[PDB]
Design a protein around this ligand. Sequence first.
Ligand SMILES: [Cl-]
Ligand code: NA
Length: 196
Amino acid sequence: GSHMSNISLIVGLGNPGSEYAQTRHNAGFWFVEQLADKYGITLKNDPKFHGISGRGNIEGHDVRLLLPMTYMNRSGQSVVPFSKFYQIAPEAILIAHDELDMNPGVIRLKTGGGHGGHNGLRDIVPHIGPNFHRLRIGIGHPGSKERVSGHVLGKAPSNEQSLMDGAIDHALSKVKLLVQGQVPQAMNQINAYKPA
Ligand SMILES: [Cl-]
Ligand code: NA
């Protein structure tokens, strides 16, 4: 199983398929694929958990990575059975996701709280509760509530993509603190990020 608030499962939320790969709603996928490449964690086909997953060493800690392949609004049909099978408590889980409530280039580490209207988190919190950690990757808001779909399934303009990419790069450099259980310090150092 997991051990205390040493992060040992890192989830990236998004949609499968080339047509969704570059959309804001895949910010979580961008973070976990970049983290997998940084630490040489293989992301392989995991049909038993309806996802793509990996396991490897991050800074001396055994860590699993998961990209649900369920579509966003069914993410819990991967995350929940995965976390149960491996006996990973929510307190040892980080979920990286796009955050409509924050600007491109803003990134925050949050413990607990609601789904904030996120259709991926909304499929997860009912089953494992809220007490997992979140890497909230700012994607901006579109204005109106029907305009939301068009925004999260949009490919960001290059300036917004640069801002998100810089924030994601910053968060990659702080994963060492997270897998070491230094959540307070990782929160201080991630939340302080400025693009410029
Ligand atoms: Cl979606
Ligand atoms: Na969906």
